Symmetry: D2
Subunit: 331 residues, 4 copies
Amino acid sequence: AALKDQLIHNLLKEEHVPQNKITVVGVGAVGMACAISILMKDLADELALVDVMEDKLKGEMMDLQHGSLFLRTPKIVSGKDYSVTANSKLVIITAGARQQEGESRLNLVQRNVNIFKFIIPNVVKYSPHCKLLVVSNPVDILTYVAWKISGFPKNRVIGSGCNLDSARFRYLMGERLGVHALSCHGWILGEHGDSSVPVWSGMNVAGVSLKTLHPELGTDADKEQWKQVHKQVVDSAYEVIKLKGYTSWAIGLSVADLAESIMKNLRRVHPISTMLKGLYGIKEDVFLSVPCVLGQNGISDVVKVTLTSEEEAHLKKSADTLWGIQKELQF
Amino acid sequence: AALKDQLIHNLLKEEHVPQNKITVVGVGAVGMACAISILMKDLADELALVDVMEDKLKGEMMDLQHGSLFLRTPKIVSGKDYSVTANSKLVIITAGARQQEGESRLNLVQRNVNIFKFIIPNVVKYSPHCKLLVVSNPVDILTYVAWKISGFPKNRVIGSGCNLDSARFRYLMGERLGVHALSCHGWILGEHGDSSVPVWSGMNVAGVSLKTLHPELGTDADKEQWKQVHKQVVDSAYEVIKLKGYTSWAIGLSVADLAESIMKNLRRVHPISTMLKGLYGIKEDVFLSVPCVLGQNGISDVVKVTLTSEEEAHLKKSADTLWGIQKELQF
Amino acid sequence: AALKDQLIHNLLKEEHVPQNKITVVGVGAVGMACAISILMKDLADELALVDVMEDKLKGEMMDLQHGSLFLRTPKIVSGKDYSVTANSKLVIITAGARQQEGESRLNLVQRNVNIFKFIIPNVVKYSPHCKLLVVSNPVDILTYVAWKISGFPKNRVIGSGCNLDSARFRYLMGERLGVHALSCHGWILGEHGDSSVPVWSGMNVAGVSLKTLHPELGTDADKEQWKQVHKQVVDSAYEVIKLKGYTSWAIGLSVADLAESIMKNLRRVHPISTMLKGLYGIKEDVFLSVPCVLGQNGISDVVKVTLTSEEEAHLKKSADTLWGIQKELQF
Amino acid sequence: AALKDQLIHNLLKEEHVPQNKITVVGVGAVGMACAISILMKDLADELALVDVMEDKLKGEMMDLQHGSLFLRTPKIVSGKDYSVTANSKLVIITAGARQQEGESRLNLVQRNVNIFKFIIPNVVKYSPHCKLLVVSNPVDILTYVAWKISGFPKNRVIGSGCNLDSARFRYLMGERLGVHALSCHGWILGEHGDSSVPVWSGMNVAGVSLKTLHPELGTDADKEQWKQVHKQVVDSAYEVIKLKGYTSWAIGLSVADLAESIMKNLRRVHPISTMLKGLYGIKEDVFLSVPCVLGQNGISDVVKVTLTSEEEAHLKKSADTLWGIQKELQF
């Protein structure tokens, strides 16, 4: 009688346990940009979305599903119940608290802790073996928060950190020199924000050190003002937010690049945030960006970058500031 | 010497004539979804954005530019002046008023006609040889308006039409039958809107006609309610608008599918908006969706679908409705 | 004080188990076209090659490895010992004996059976959960042979069957009609070779049945001679071998498309060879091509195409011939 | 009442000039690896193949065409007559007699010059505005020969040079250090062959100079013997040929990466051979590999690498050797 049975003879029943699943938590502009970038790079065989507002969540799921003909990811699901996230290889956290006028730094972080106390145990319950990738800001502190609540080993808790900062730096270098960002090399490390560290000694094109060629590179009194290129990077989100209200596209592409290294076990090096105690002279439980080898087991190795005394002092001062906030948090 | 001159020896003075340029008009949610999809499919060597609000326009340009490292489109430009659009191969028009929750796309015509009076002459002035792809609603009427204003031959003026309607239909078919939309075949023709026509005789999997297998298909007297699948297609935009306020992702992917056929000269068949005088008993200059062969010179051929008496009458009345609106337009 | 230890601090020891591994058995021209096509479509995180000629095998492995910079498959391995194939999701069999001057079909099949008696138990020992895709000719008999030796359930033993035949048919359709093969639809079923069945009733563009428009379609006295298009398909490998010595590129692309459906769980429909007992009027353990739903567990469903008396009789005639040979084989 | 005319209504007569056409000259194993890699990267809207053997040419064309369903390059053509190559943007030269140990290098130059005296003028007749990419060996001499015969400006005549050599080097670096070749950086410059120059000062991971970390790098007294990695690179082609008879896959992927930079105007930096008179201390009309900015107008800029006195002297000795051969050629 039924059309499906007249057309199709079934040979095998339903044991659907996903094999290459990714979850995005939060369907704000950042989360949806991560989602569309992951879908157009064929990184997952199932995509799950979760957030607390049911109507926008279902509408975003339906909008993506209606494009299925043009994609190669056959299952897209969503819900406020974290059961929809079960058996994920990778869970990307973009949700957080909305900022309030006149609230202190410590109060903002604690409000995000209170949200993570609900999100993280739910994630761990349904995907006990996943990798966690935290994007929510302030990212170095909130990556620590996810690590603390989850109980996961440090190799499986990753912060997006300075990955986009470095991409922006390479684009701006490329604009100045007349070359693609792919062929400009340079690293921004440390705390994601106003105190990140541009490692001038490593900037190069085709292996030619820009500092040896132009020795005053990175000093304020440089007639070409290369120090203001780093200031442009730290101010980039501020300028884009003032023009269009928020940033989305670039972080979505940077996050999908990280997901590609994880899902395909590439062991590429990225400037991302990892638990740094015992390395680079740090003695507290803080997360900072260094060049990390990224693959299917998360962060397996760290590159030991040679830093000047000025550069080391910036990192150590960031570690002190982060721990000062973290030791006052209520878990 | 400058650092650039110490590092790089220039051998050639170049003139910037782009060879595969695409312009998106409008940086609303639809326009930006078209932009990110075209960028992630490597369809252009230069992308230009144009709209009337300068701050929002510059912010979106900067956000995309910040993702350059992850892309293979080396030049992204923008501006309110249409000189930034010069020498485009393809110009995609997405600006205009969008439907409220439960509003007919036909209720937008007077507002969007007035906007097209400014846009189309500016586009034609700076890219006299481009193809025009209209996405703004009502898309069938606005493609006619663009054709009249531009003076272009009809093969170069295309509406996105029912490409998305048919993609939605194939997705819903696949969900009912347990197969990917790629392997479900079926066509929605006519108005992109409430009077679209589902061609039941062409619906098939692996060449097996579903109507011959299940003769009740498409009638009210069908226990399985397949006629309601077309109603789901007609209601799709309304349901997503009710949940998130607008639609974006699916139309962006549908538009990128059309741009791929044009830029790569594929000569694939799509259900898109074209001038159908002389067809199905129509003697006025109305545009609506039929299956069209799409390539680098636009629409070169149309497939002549066999319709039932009921299907053809439904096309003819919808064409009369569109003409009733068109003949009263002032531009 | 090794350079690797000065540069990199190890944080994690790892016993690496790959998650999306593919093996190609046989590094002849067919096997290597499959390998390059799979590598350029980013379907696997590890590729293994196996063959009996040690030097040629190592040379092909090294040549592919030296392109790693341009790929996203981080590990390529090879060896005569099947331990290099352990934990594969998908194993593709292209090895076998070539047809001899003055030899029966029972004796050519037996020479290939003896090859499969060594290969298949080795594959099963190291990848007990894999799907098997047999490409070696005669493909329908050798897929039966692989199934019998492996002990696998029928859903995990797949023959490439008529998949390329149908792609060639769609290309030739497109050449005659002036449209891309993507927009021409048609199915070749049954036994891969001179006795395959072109299903004239399912051929269409945009859902328009060519048979209804052109009732002579599929008859000998057809002024347009469409039956000769099927004859061109069955002769194609023959014509290419006479021109260049062998065929490879098209089959490599066809096999990678099947691998994509499996690895991404797409549930697309393909005309491939499956154990057909109990369906289409067949009563014995034979494999023939029908439209099959293909995903991460292999063939889960079969489409039941409505066939004419003549069409059904062709399939029954093929099953009788195949079973007659199979019962004479020495396992 | 032909089927095509009942099915399709023509609206536009054919006048077709392709917009992104590529020609490959030579359908040996190298030429065909370039062809399949270019096809699987969607770089062209038309691909032409040309060579002197008509049967093999037609067989390779047919094999590729039969895979059209799986590709997005809609037109593939071939012939011995160079009219089939008309209006190419990029023409890739792979034909010639192959380098063989024991066969005089000076005699091979003479044999391949005469082949180019036939090929180059035929290419330029039909594509007067193309870029030339020379892959045939000896590559630095034959790029000069193509430049003299065509009369093209030097930016439009490019040799594949040391591009693959450097890719091989990065793979071998990655195997030693435990990271992907993408994250290992290093440059092989100069004359392609036994006298190429590995630039130890530019080798780095994440901007960390290996030479500063390990000052004996590249010296005979290096306990890890990294000089033997450069020897591995120069010997790689010969070792692969000894194992499987020829080399093809890696060069195909390397050539397709250069083709991507040209067709998409990327302005990425590659170590490829360019006319370097006036730079690096060279005064004669010679081509050697240096880091070159590559885009839609060929090579527009050159990076000036800081070299040691010994490295600088090696490049001069290579230039003297090349001009000694070139000074006796007649065009």
